[PDB]
Amino acid sequence: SMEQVAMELRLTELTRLLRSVLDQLQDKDPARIFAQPVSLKEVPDYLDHIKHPMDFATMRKRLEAQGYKNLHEFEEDFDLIIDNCMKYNARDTVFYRAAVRLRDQGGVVLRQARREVDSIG
Structure with missing residues (x-):
């Protein structure tokens, strides 16, 4: 059709x-x-801690298969990247701090993406 x-x-x-x-x-x-993705060879306990691992490569694979139907789905996967890291890693670590900085800086980008998605439809 x-x-x-x-x-x-x-x-x-x-x-x-x-x-x-x-x-x-x-x-x-x-x-x-x-x-x-976090390597399960190098962090063999990871899945005991984190139930839905996420990373930019995995997101890119889903994207290229047109696997995000809306911005909410895409944001959910981005939030998993941040949130997973902030749980597994302590506040004083380079990993945690990297995630905070990615979250803060990414907020700016996502705010305008939402406007564009609503605006263009």
């Missing part, structure tokens, strides 16, 4: 805007602390 095409075009254009958002958020992580 043409309606299914139009919906698919909307998903594609959302994906475009989320790709740009993802790039901008990841630039707020110049240390690359959140770039890849």
Whole structure:
């Protein structure tokens, strides 16, 4: 149907805007602390602590499959990256502090992304 095409075009254009958002958020992580999944070889207890691991690579895979239907879904995965790190790692650690800085800086980006998603539709 043409309606299914139009919906698919909307998903594609959302994906475009989320790709740009993802790039901008990841630039707020110049240390690359959140770039890849936590290795279960190197942190063998991780899944006892964190039930839904997340990282920028995993998000990028979902994005490229057009797997985010709306901005809320994408924000949920970003918040997991931050929140997981702030639970596993103590306040005095480079990891925790990196997450706070990513959260604070990412807020700015996400605030305007929400306006753009509502505005363009």
